[PDB]
């Protein structure tokens, strides 16, 4: 039951503080995610989802994808989903979250200076050597192990900025994707669905226009142009008493979702690889 | 505004940005007017087009009101055009 | 070899410079943003009508047309966004060609409105290719003359292959 | 007799036009297949079965809101590889005769089509042929008159409201590609006008707008158009390039271990096209 | 031109 619930490896080293860690069960799922649903929702405004591709008889290609939790009014920081290392400290209110979570974020973004600062500050906790350092070791080791696992360089033809028609030139969203950590890159791959999927000279289009944007600020739930997509969301009381006991009800509902649709995936001669 | 400021910390930079937007807009407005000059206007506006215009103007005004901001003959003529005071001469 | 390819690149630059005034078109403001429209070539279509246009290929050698650009000093290790920009450029070129092929008939009616002449079947393709080549000239202007004698890049070559396969299939599908 | 003199009774009513199809050969019994949805008093005047069979379209609901308004919407059943005439989701009056195989289907359905599409010449031809075909007087005449009366009643119910909607100021709809910088959109509004009033109502009930401005708030359901309209009619084509993949998973192990109960995004392709404007709610 | 080719 490996709990991959990154951001649940958080221990309230302060005695007066107790960390509930009320986060989603799916962390025990040996999936491509390294962060389970509730952490994803809380810290990236994303909801996990799956997109079947071939589902006829036993070919069951089910590409994963997450959904915007950003309305059509948020902007700038409010709209940024996965901030860049240059702005994540600003987008996230690190000061408002526990120092262990701050350490996790700093490790993810490779902010070793912030890591050192946090451990230096913890140096001056009352029970520092007793258990604060133990908490530091546990959290740091868990985060480092997760990061190494994500990083492919440790001991394929998916392009995210290559969809954008009307762009002047440059792309570079893939440049920033490269600049991201292995964990962040794997998260982007796992949550963002390329708008196109080419298999051995066979192209499938899933959307007529990409839904996400990638730039220097990071990943943004913005549109390539135009206005933002519409994205909506016991203690018995006197009002809870109902009055006297006494319209397309018969039809199914199309979700009012905004799944992360952006990019082009190219697959070589390899056939319908289902391993 | 920042892109325009690239060319200098101009005193009236906000007014300048608004002017540039409205000028690029007036270019295509002159284009439309040329396209339609030959045609005969009606005594009163087309009602459907008028409704569309009012409805879109609502949103435009809302946005530009939410975003609060901060050599006279031709200047004032063009400014009156920008402010849509068609009494311009 | 790739030296001949560098020669090809310089030749296409100079030859674009040549015909854009031998036939004085240089519709150099246009790009591959979307399907081209005859509204930007009316007079250019008139000038085209002065020549017999059957001397044109239905398919586009997207491979040989774009491969020379792949030769550049990527070893500078200063602008990998340049390589990413090239990838974007090639992919958008492939999309442009695919859309042109898919809606070739639609452009046929467009140019039927604009200069209803038998040579329209070739005028459509000539407009496509000429706008594309103007875009190529602009892209060359954007990039620097950092062409090496030889340069390997597996990722770019693979992208070229996979996109151009779609391009060629689409062009081939233009039956008649 | 039991009922009050006249006193028009109140009951449910099958609403899909095609429910009236019956074999003019009284000696041949026939039952048309109708989805039960036909008995819902809604804007749809075609049942799911006929819709899928003839137009390649499936109904669907789009929640809208505080108060959750449900906007009717149809979706593509068109596969990715279908081409040409197959892409005509709803044929125009100049192409329906060809898209729909009048020869292959029943005379009553052919009359229904020539009524929906305003083809008075074809309607008259069918009427006269039936007058001079088979035992017209005995019961075939009455059956034909019943079918014609039902179709005309539906059309008379729809067309007045359709015209009032057309001239309506408060409610405005524009069936075109909101990306005016596009070539596959065209005079979509003109083509929609060319369509019949009942056909216009069907189009309204089926195609949702890309944007929707309610009073001062605008909701953008798409950054793109999922279908277009041309002279042929409603075409299930991507205005900008490659067709959208439509798996059609129904009707005509570690992966799952990880993907146990888990939110799944449908692969359906709803109909999003054009601009819509409304004052107040009117709901 | 369908024959001059
Ligand atoms: Zn029915």
From Swiss-Prot, chain D:
InterPro entries: Baculo_VP39. Keywords: Capsid protein, Late protein, Virion. This is Major capsid protein. Transmembrane segments: none annotated. Belongs to the baculoviridae major capsid protein family. Expressed late in infection. GO terms for cellular component: host cell nuclear matrix; viral capsid; virion component. GO terms for molecular function: structural molecule activity. It comes from the Viruses. It is found in: Virion. Most abundant structural protein of the nucleocapsid produced during the infection cycle. The monomers are arranged in stacked rings around the nucleoprotein core. It comes from Autographa californica nuclear polyhedrosis virus.
From Swiss-Prot, chain E:
Disulfide bonds: none annotated. It is found in: Host nucleus; Virion. Homodimer. Interacts with host nuclear F-actin. This is Capsid-associated protein VP80. It comes from Autographa californica nuclear polyhedrosis virus (AcMNPV). The chain holds residues 490 to 494 of 691 of the full protein. Structural protein that plays a role in the packaging of nucleocapsids and in their egress from the nucleus toward the cell periphery. It comes from the Viruses.
